[PDB]
Each structure stands twice: as C-alpha cells, then as structure tokens.
Amino acid sequence: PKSMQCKVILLDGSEYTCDVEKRSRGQVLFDKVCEHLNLLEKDYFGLTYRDAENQKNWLDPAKEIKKQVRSGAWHFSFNVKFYPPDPAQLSEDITRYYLCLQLRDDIVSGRLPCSFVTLALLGSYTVQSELGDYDPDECGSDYISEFRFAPNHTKELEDKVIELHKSHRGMTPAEAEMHFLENAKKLSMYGVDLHHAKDSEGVEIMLGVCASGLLIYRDRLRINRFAWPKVLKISYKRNNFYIKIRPGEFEQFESTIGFKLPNHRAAKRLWKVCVEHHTFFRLL
C-alpha cells in the first residue's frame, strides 16, 4: 500500500510529518494532525495548501488529497477555518490556545489590523500565559521580548506590553488566553477572510467572509453587509461570483448581486468559502 509523506506547518511554527495512503481523503491527514495536537473541537480548523497560482486553498476533507494538491508538494498549514464569534463558549482551553496562536499570526502578518493599545494588551496576555507573573530581573528599561506582537515593533510597544504585563499578576494561562480572545474577538477584521474583487461597474472592492455574513468594503465610507440568513444561493460563472438575496418584506422579487474576481479559480474559491461559512454559522 503506497504512502505519501505529508508535512504540516503547525500554528507554533513547528513542522509535523506523517505518511498517508496516496488515495487518502483530506480527513485522514486532518485526523492525524488533530490527534498530534490533542484537539477535540476540530470543527473550527482545517488544513490549507498553496496551489499552482500560489493562492491559499482549504483542503476539502471529503475529497482525495492528490486531486486537490495535483502537481504540487504535499505541504500544508494547520489553520483556523471558522473563527468562533464567542470563544468563551468553546468547551476546551486547548481549543482557545490554538485560536490564540492563529490570531497571533493574523496580527503579526497584518491580516488583523489592531490599535497600538490593543496590540500591547494582546501581547501582555500572551506573555502572562506563557511566562507567568512579571519579573523585573529579566527586563531592564531596554527590554525587547522574543515574542512577536505586531507587524512593526517599536520600543514604545514593548514598554506598553511590560506595563500591562505587570497588571496581570496571579493570572493563569487559560484565564490570560480567554482575556486575549475577549479583546481579539471585538476587532473589526476578526475572522474576516478578504478577497479582492470589482463590483458590477468595475470599481475595486474587497469581499470579506465571516460569521456575520458577506461584507463589501469600498473604502472608509459605505461598508455594506449581507447576513448569511438573507443569502439563499451563492454561485459562480467564469470570473464572476453571484449572491441571491431573499426578497425584502412586500418585495415581489429576489435580487442577485454579481462581482468580478481576479480569475475563475478565485471566483470558485470565494464561492466555496461562502457556502462553507453559510452552512457552519447556520448550524453553530
């Protein structure tokens, strides 16, 4: 029985290696990675890979791995797929831990924009969880943490992490991680998957996919939103993506809204993640 080596970048930046049978469905590899991680609340997570166009794709656990990675390497990342709107309702601390690791990368990468003060507050909770109570011995007036807190580090940000870290004495790791999440979940881009697009008139927009629906970003004026329950049908055709909206009260007709994506793969990718969000957050 012929086996393919899989490599998975974990959220702590370490590499997990295993073998699966070459005709294996994605779920096989996902189950091995979650067992490695001691993760039971698996439904929020997934594996990604980079395609022949170097775009992020979710590995579909119900499809053969070989039919998704096709010509590319069997190289994956373990990621949060569905960001819970209320992480306090997760059953296990370890789930919250992995969600914090993902959010730390969302912040350092700049996918999750964050004010100076919230960068410092999130950093302070991470330091409190992982090192415990503040110790002056380790940190002089010139201390720079090894922890990555932001897309751009400043001395002033390091100073503020330390000042807030002092205020968390006695706080235990699950408690600090819960505080991390109670702050992070409020950020306007929390759990938003962003896709470049153009409207039916050719204006550059961004489409954001998240728990609360499909968001349309044009600039800093007029953020439109379609809550998932209003969305009856999502579809794609060539480079175009369409949403069918329920008729409003007393309206005779449904309305279809059309967008232009970079190419056909990008339209299919956006369709798939919208359908998955719609189903997941209908049920959650």
Ligand X SMILES: C[C@H](O)CNCc1c(Cl)cccc1Cl
Residues in contact with ligand X by CB under 6 A are 7-9, 15, 75, 77, 196, 204, 206
Dihedrals phi, psi of 233, to nearest 5 degrees = -155, 135
Q: Structure tokens of 97?
A: 């831990």
* Min dist. Cβ of residue 203 to ligand X (A): 9
Q: How far apart are CA 164 and CA 120, in angstroms?
A: 7
- How many helices (H) and strands (E) the chain has is answered by 7, 12
Q: How far apart are CA 267 and CA 153, in angstroms?
A: 36
* Min dist. Cβ of residue 217 to ligand X (A): 9
Judged by CB, which is closer to ligand X: 53, or 254?
53
Which residue intervals of the chain are DSSP H helices?
A: 26-37, 66-69, 93-108, 116-131, 155-167, 173-184, 264-283
Judged by CB, which is closer to ligand X: 256, or 263?
263
Judged by CB, which is closer to ligand X: 127, or 215?
215
Computed on alpha carbons and rounded to an integer, the radius of gyration of the chain in Å comes to 21
State which amino acid sits at residue 222: R
16 in Cβ contact with 34 (< 8 Å): no
* Min dist. Cβ of residue 269 to ligand X (A): 15
Judged by CB, which is closer to ligand X: 198, or 244?
198
DSSP 194: E
Among candidate residues 153, 162, 104, the one with its CA nearest the CA of residue 133: 162
104 in Cβ contact with 148 (< 8 Å): yes
Bridge-based pairing of strands 3-9 and 75-80 is parallel
Beta sheet of 255-260, edge-to-edge order:
224-226, 213-217, 204-210, 193-199, 255-260, 240-245, 231-237
Judged by CB, which is closer to ligand X: 75, or 153?
75
* Min dist. Cβ of residue 7 to ligand X (A): 3
* Min dist. Cβ of residue 158 to ligand X (A): 27
* Min dist. Cβ of residue 229 to ligand X (A): 27
Judged by CB, which is closer to ligand X: 9, or 275?
9
* Min dist. Cβ of residue 121 to ligand X (A): 29
Judged by CB, which is closer to ligand X: 174, or 206?
206
